[PDB]
């Protein structure tokens, strides 16, 4: 059964958009030094965007910024920023505008998470997650938005959440709550700031080869109809699409990128997929 | 006519729905219980026999309300001063709750703050203030009560009051929409995670409840967007709350109930603006 | 105490009438599928509370036996009318008889349904169509006809549709049901909006499994409340929604599932079996 | 610059092909209602990008004129097959022909629909049933038949249903449509889960109003204009492409923000101007 999934759901890990389509465009990406943020930056730069990446670890940031800069031939700028601090965010936005200009693409990708029984969390642990995910995305959006309105310019905004932002989930509760907050913000500002030329969309990723929580991966895939984890390149292509001018009428959308995981686990009778064809013949007799 | 039809068939029943003394021996904890919706909920639960404990920042109003309800129902209402955004204040509040009344059977997360403002006019501190009261406050209260319930091998029904815009978003109330959305995801998360400890979690999403008013013309415009043709009442909301926090709803867990007179379905439906089309105009349209 | 004991102690079913004696005096209720299972349960409670109930379904014999049984129990007369809801002519006659024998309904419960549990590939076009007809078209026809008569008479009513938790999420193996049930949900939200000016409000209950081969025990493991629901509990919820206490509840969709949907839908809820001791080891890794 | 100027500048439609030239070569696409409007636009893009297209609907004349017109424009052959989707036999015969003239589909688009805008109380039972039959049962029959054939041939495909933003919310005045479309969404999510093992994936686009008087609805669209057929086609093509091979069970709004605008309780405050907001905070 995995031969059908491998042949018909095989990943296409190369650029989807036309060459140089992001030339003249400036992108700002929180968490752009690692994992998903890095892949989005990698693609946007390769397609001609001037990228600006921000997070806490300047060492990883600079290394990644230089690595992509030489790989694509387009300059990637690194700026140190803790998104939960409004003054640092203010500085980062100001520096973004000086070294690159007002952004056409804003990607809120920075996150933190604990996997834990909720009863083992301290108030500070809870607050930490809310600060990075919700308030951090809020501060970045508030400041850039304020500058864009000031400069009579618009932009595409993108927030990366999770499939559990919409459903909730035990064991990742502060994240689930913060991420749900991030989605509500996108929907709110898609409505409010459309008049300013700003649009807001969301990707809800399932487990991507970077999941979280050798035998565990095999178990995870059993809950994924597409029979595999996602890839950073595939996610980047989706992100680039939503941040591109081809999607200029996509606003307030929320797109699952999960190989079908959410629809599988959420469906009441989907546990019946374990039933074999011979067993079904017996049940259909009654 | 429309007005007389709505008034007759959507008439508010503002009396206790549940059987008298149905909450005897139960203890309820209500954040924001001193005013508005919290007060209405406290008043009903106390009237039905519950021992209530109400918590908020303003001790004077909280004490006044607690004494007012106590005298009306003959059941004690305890006031405790608490800023829910302060985890240490929350810890001491829950500690006092357990000593004065007992472990709660009912926990109502009702305290909130809001600004109506263009988002561009908000400071980071204004945004954070709302997130702090709504999301972190409800989290801190839930976390600490939950910890004490698990320790005590006891369960409880939890209720969070959100808004119809928690699920949809809304411009002009963005910090609130975000924080209230977080509150809903928390309820769904802990309905699942903590069912095994005897805790269940539900949500009511209220539309506008009768509680800038000036001419009264704004209310007239608000009602045009409500199918039921009126604002809701505190007593009706309280009945819904009491039901969800009652043993009759012991199998209701992770539910989200709109209490809005049909407002959300009206405004969200793409072609609902066609309600302003007359019978005559429809005749010509159906003839095209 | 263990999980089971906490669930038993703190989610115990209260299977007696919730609303005050005689609260439905002078109310007429129309309940499709009112002769068996959930429909019979709702009919029993409404009648006991004073309503004049009219039940309608295909099997006149089962319908008559139920109507007699409830009439003798409660003292209040329950009328039985033979109706296949997918037949619009039969629905017309049924509503005409309803108005003649009882009066214009104050409560309309669309409860009749059909369902197959089967791999979708095994379904014939007729098998699919059969489910759509009973569930979606049947609820539509009953709703259209009563609505037309209520508008004519300048009378209002509370409408209630019983769907399922999988109407919102979808689910394999019950696909025609999921589609038809989702349709029934959209209908309620649509008419909640459209027909408020006529004094008609529309709400929905989404039930999980309600108690009536070892799979019963298996379902419970996916229910945070640790048991199946009961008919009496569902009836209480139904009565509340169809009562004047809920006269401002309109367009609501209420899960009645012991937390099943939130449990199965949450990505990390598969970690629920990890014990106190095992969690210490996981936290040691992070 | 004013609202209309920013909206036009930063939400300008890009109506050219997004995906790489010939990216759909060796792929067969089956589109219901492919002879007109949105179906026509998706067929045109898929054919121009190299796909072998098959279109199916009731009106053979239009279904031949569009197919010939696309064939000559793109150079790639488009086949026309008469099919009323609400009839299982016509569907079965249509699936058999699709496999004969082109082969097993790699792309299935369920786009065919019918609608009335009417107060619900003026609808006959037949009028309701018509919409349910075309939209829900029609999509079901097409999906069931093609699905069955793909399982038998051990072949996979990407499925795409075009619904509406009101499928999720419901809406007065379009009730049979809202219901049937809601059902189509549920079907997609259901089969996304059920048929993963068969290599079949299912997604949904929910469009707002597309430019194919009624222009005051633009005041309810944050992006400040109606959408275009070419923009929708680009989104549709992406979802039906191998670039989207891990996208499954998704529902994408393509509405310029209309749904979030109308559904948000306080969004009716959008006309309040800069000057007016000062006194409110006092
Ligand atoms: C497939 C689905 C994927 C889903 C993923 C997502 O949705 S988003 C995932 C995004 N996040 C990540 O990938 C990783 C996230 N985070 C981490 O790896 C790291 O743990 C971290 C960056 C959050 C560390 O945070 P900080 O450096 O700010 O330090 P932190 O705030 O944790 O330390 C202070 C408090 O946290 C508590 N703390 C520390 N680690 C903890 C843990 N594992 N579980 C619980 N609590 C913890 C301490 O007890 C302390 O409490 P006291 O102050 O009371 O003494
Ligand atoms: C019908 C449906 C309704 C929906 C309702 C809901 O969802 S919730 C319903 C709640 N609705 C309400 O009417 C709430 C009203 N009031 C309250 O909840 C509370 O009294 C309160 C939030 C004002 C209390 O505030 P606190 O004392 O906790 O904190 P405080 O407001 O001082 O925080 C400081 C920041 O607030 C900002 N601030 C204060 N008023 C503001 C205003 N009207 N508009 C914008 N910003 C404001 C200041 O600029 C300051 O930022 P700087 O320090 O950077 O300068
Ligand atoms: C356990 C959990 C339950 C959960 C339930 C729910 O959520 S909702 C609950 C609703 N229903 C139920 O729980 C249970 C049962 N419901 C019913 O039995 C329904 O009333 C009913 C549809 C069977 C009754 O309608 P009919 O008598 O018209 O059905 P009938 O079988 O005559 O319809 C003719 C077509 O059905 C097909 N058919 C019958 N059984 C079938 C099956 N198990 N799998 C596939 N197809 C089947 C026949 O092949 C035939 O197609 P052809 O002519 O092409 O050969
Ligand atoms: C913004 C728009 C979004 C739209 C979304 C979509 O998905 S579709 C987009 C809009 N386009 C369309 O809807 C196109 C076509 N829609 C259709 O419903 C159909 O294809 C069609 C009616 C034109 C043709 O179907 P038929 O051959 O069955 O035509 P027929 O006239 O027999 O239709 C059957 C029933 O429709 C009823 N009917 C026709 N017009 C009606 C109207 N304006 N209001 C109420 N009812 C009407 C008739 O009375 C009849 O019921 P009786 O026999 O009882 O008298
Ligand atoms: N990978 C998956 O399978 C998966 C699944 C679902 C959702 N997601 C989402 O996708 C996004 C990226 O995931 P990922 O796995 O790639 O993340 P990651 O690489 O593991 O790390 C998170 C990123 O956020 C930055 N960050 C953390 N705290 C910050 C702070 N306070 N201020 C500024 N930046 C901060 C980090 O940089 P610094 O350490 O230098 O600060 C890092 O680049 C996240 O939003 C996540 O929720 C991922
Ligand atoms: N009324 C409506 O039409 C409506 C509509 C939608 C949603 N809601 C929701 O319903 C709930 C009640 O609304 P309401 O109108 O009754 O509110 P309210 O009376 O105007 O006041 C909110 C309550 O929360 C308390 N509170 C505020 N900040 C607090 C904090 N930091 N710590 C502890 N308590 C705090 C206040 O008491 P103190 O000042 O003493 O702290 C007050 O009792 C809220 O959750 C609201 O979001 C109401
Ligand atoms: N029981 C559960 O655990 C559960 C779970 C989720 C949802 N539900 C929902 O709850 C409702 C009641 O379910 P139930 O368990 O009570 O099922 P049930 O006992 O089998 O009752 C189904 C009823 O529908 C009637 N019916 C079937 N086809 C009809 C038609 N063509 N015209 C008129 N009536 C028809 C039947 O009466 P006739 O045979 O005489 O026609 C029967 O009374 C259904 O809507 C179901 O989808 C139940
Ligand atoms: N245009 C918009 O602004 C808009 C907005 C939201 C959603 N949509 C959705 O987009 C899709 C296409 O809409 P459109 O605007 O392109 O409408 P359209 O131009 O009128 O196309 C509808 C198509 O469906 C076909 N059709 C109707 N009944 C059929 C049947 N019984 N069997 C087979 N085919 C049938 C028609 O072909 P024949 O007449 O030859 O049978 C026609 O090509 C629809 O699903 C619609 O719901 C459109």
Helix, strand, coil shares of chain A, percent, nearest 5, are: 50, 15, 35
Neighbours of D89 (CB within 10 A): 10
- How do A50-55 and B77-81 pair as beta strands? unpaired
- The residue of chain B nearest to residue C156, with distances taken between CA atoms, is B9
Token look-up 């970045």 returns A140
- Tell me which of B30, B31, B32, B237 to substitute to probe ligand 6's pocket, judged by most ligand atoms within 8 Å of the beta carbon: B32
Q: What method did the depositors use to determine the structure? A: X-ray
The response to whether residue B96 sits with its C-beta less than 6 Å from ligand 6 reads no
Residue ID of nearest Cα to ligand 8 atom 33: D57
Residues of C with CB below 8 A from B238's CB? none
Whole-angstrom distance, CA of residue D117 vs CA of residue D100: 39
Resolution at which this structure was determined, Å? 1.8
The response to whether residue D167 sits with its C-beta less than 6 Å from ligand 8 reads no
The catalytic residue among B165, B194, B201, B259 is B165
3-state secondary structure of B106: strand
Ramachandran category for residue A259: left, alpha or beta (phi over 0 → left; psi -120 to 50 → alpha)? left
- Tell me which of D57, D59, D130 to substitute to probe ligand 4's pocket, judged by most ligand atoms within 8 Å of the beta carbon: D130
- Specify burial of residue B56 (Cβ count, 10 A radius: 0-12, 13-18, 19+): buried
Whole-angstrom distance, CA of residue B261 vs CA of residue C252: 9
Residue A202 near residue A186 (C-beta atoms within 8 A): yes
Distances (CA, A) of D147 to A71, A152, B139, D102, D195: 44, 51, 47, 16, 9
Ligand closest to the CA atom of residue C162: 7
Instruction: Quote the tokens at residue B122.
Output: 């908000």
Whole-angstrom distance, CA of residue D123 vs CA of residue C148: 10
* A168: nearest CB among C171, C266, C272: C266
User: What CATH fold (topology level) applies to the domain B1-288?
Assistant: Rossmann fold (3.40.50)
CA of C39 to the centre of ligand 5 (A): 50
Whole-angstrom distance, CA of residue D266 vs CA of residue A60: 43
Distance from CA of D37 to the nearest CA of B (A): 20
Neighbours of A286 (CB within 10 A): 4
Per domain, the residue ranges of chain A are 1-286
The response to whether residue D177 sits with its C-beta less than 6 Å from ligand 4 reads yes
DSSP D90-125: HHHHHHHHHHHHT-S-SEEEE---------GGG--H
Distances (CA, A) of A264 to A209, A223, C269, D198: 19, 7, 14, 14
The response to whether residue B200 sits with its C-beta less than 6 Å from ligand 6 reads no
Atom of ligand 8 nearest to the CA of D161: 45
Question: Phi, psi at residue B258, to the nearest 5°?
Answer: -70, 135
Under 8 Å CB pairs connecting chains B and C tally to: 207
A1-286 CATH pick, 3.40.50.2300, 3.40.50.720, 3.30.70.20, 3.40.630.30: 3.40.50.720
Is A207 among the annotated ligand-binding positions? yes
Whole-angstrom distance, CA of residue A208 vs CA of residue A38: 13
Is B46 among the annotated ligand-binding positions? no
Whole-angstrom distance, CA of residue C155 vs CA of residue B174: 40
The response to whether residue C38 sits with its C-beta less than 6 Å from ligand 3 reads no
**Do C194 and D175 make contact, defined as CB atoms within 8 angstroms?**
yes
Distance from CA of A269 to the nearest CA of C (A): 6
Give the CA angle between residues C204, D190, D245 to the nearest 5°. Answer: 135
The response to whether residue D34 sits with its C-beta less than 6 Å from ligand 8 reads no
3-state secondary structure of D78: strand
Whole-angstrom distance, CA of residue B18 vs CA of residue B47: 10
Helix (H) or strand (E) holding C93: helix C88-101
* C193: nearest CB among B5, B249, B265: B265
Distances (CA, A) of D125 to C92, C137, C141, C179: 10, 9, 6, 19
DSSP C252-267: -EEEESTTHHHHHHST
Give the CA angle between residues C120, C122, C125 to the nearest 5°. Answer: 80
Residues of C with CB below 8 A from B249's CB? 237
**Do C147 and D194 make contact, defined as CB atoms within 8 angstroms?**
no
**Do C10 and B154 make contact, defined as CB atoms within 8 angstroms?**
yes
Residue B135 near residue B183 (C-beta atoms within 8 A): yes
Question: Phi, psi at residue A195, to the nearest 5°?
Answer: -60, -20
* D172: nearest CB among B173, B275, B286: B275
Length of chain C: 286
The catalytic residue among A164, A193, A200, A257 is A164
Q: Collect all residues with Cβ–Cβ distance below 8 Å to C234 and sequence separation of at least 6.
A: C38, C41, C42, C205, C207, C210, C256
Minimal CA–CA distance to D190: which of B35, B140, A263? A263
Minimal CA–CA distance to A263: which of C182, C176, B255, D191? D191
Is D164 among the annotated ligand-binding positions? no
Question: Phi, psi at residue B14, to the nearest 5°?
Answer: -105, 50
Residue C46 near residue C34 (C-beta atoms within 8 A): no
The response to whether residue A162 sits with its C-beta less than 6 Å from ligand 1 reads yes
- Residues C60-83 as b/e (b if ≥16 CB within 10 A, e otherwise) read eeebeebbeebbeebebebbbbbb
Task: Note the CATH number of domain D1-282.
Answer: 3.40.50.720
**Do B119 and A142 make contact, defined as CB atoms within 8 angstroms?**
yes
Residues of B with CB below 8 A from D218's CB? none
- B14 forms beta bridges with none
Minimal CA–CA distance to A198: which of B169, D9, B268? D9
Helices (H), A161-276: 164-167, 173-192, 215-221, 232-243, 261-266
Neighbours of B14 (CB within 10 A): 14
Question: Phi, psi at residue C139, to the nearest 5°?
Answer: -65, -40
Whole-angstrom distance, CA of residue A226 vs CA of residue D201: 8
Residue B191 near residue C259 (C-beta atoms within 8 A): yes
Indicate the angle between helix axes C175-194 and C125-132, nearest 10 degrees: 30
- D203 forms beta bridges with D160
Residues of D with CB below 8 A from A4's CB? 154, 156, 197-199
């Amino acid at each position: 059964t995995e031969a059908l999934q491998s042949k018909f759901f095989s990943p296409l890990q190369k650029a989807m958009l036309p060459p140089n389509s992001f030339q003249g465009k400036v992108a700002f990406i929180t968490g752009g030094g690692t994992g998903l943020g890095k892949g989005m930056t990698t693609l946007l730069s390769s397609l001609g965007a001037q990228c600006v990446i921000a997070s806490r670890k300047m060492d990883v940031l600079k290394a990644t910024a230089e690595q992509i800069s030489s790989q694509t031939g387009n300059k990637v700028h690194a700026i140190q920023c803790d998104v939960r601090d409004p003054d640092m965010v203010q500085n980062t936005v100001s520096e973004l505008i000086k070294v690159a200009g007002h952004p056409n693409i804003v990607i809120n990708n920075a996150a933190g998470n604990f996997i834990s029984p909720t009863e083992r969390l301290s108030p500070n642990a809870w607050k930490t997650i809310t600060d990075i995910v919700l308030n951090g995305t809020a501060f970045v959006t508030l400041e850039i938005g304020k500058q864009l309105i000031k400069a009579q310019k618009g932009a595409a905004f993108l927030s990366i959440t999770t499939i559990y932002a919409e459903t909730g989930s035990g064991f990742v509760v502060p994240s689930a709550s913060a991420k749900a907050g991030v989605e509500a913000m996108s929907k709110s500002l898609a409505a409010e700031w459309g008049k300013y030329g700003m649009r807001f969309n969301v990707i809800q990723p399932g487990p991507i080869k970077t999941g979280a929580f050798g035998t565990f991966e095999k178990e995870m895939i059993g809950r994924i109809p597409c029979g595999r984890l996602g890839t950073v390149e595939e996610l980047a292509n989706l992100a680039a699409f939503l941040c591109s001018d081809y999607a200029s009428w996509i606003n307030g959308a929320v797109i699952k990128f999960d190989g079908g995981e959410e629809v599988l686990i959420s469906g009441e009778f989907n546990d019946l997929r374990k039933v074999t064809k011979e067993q079904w013949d017996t049940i259909e007799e009654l």
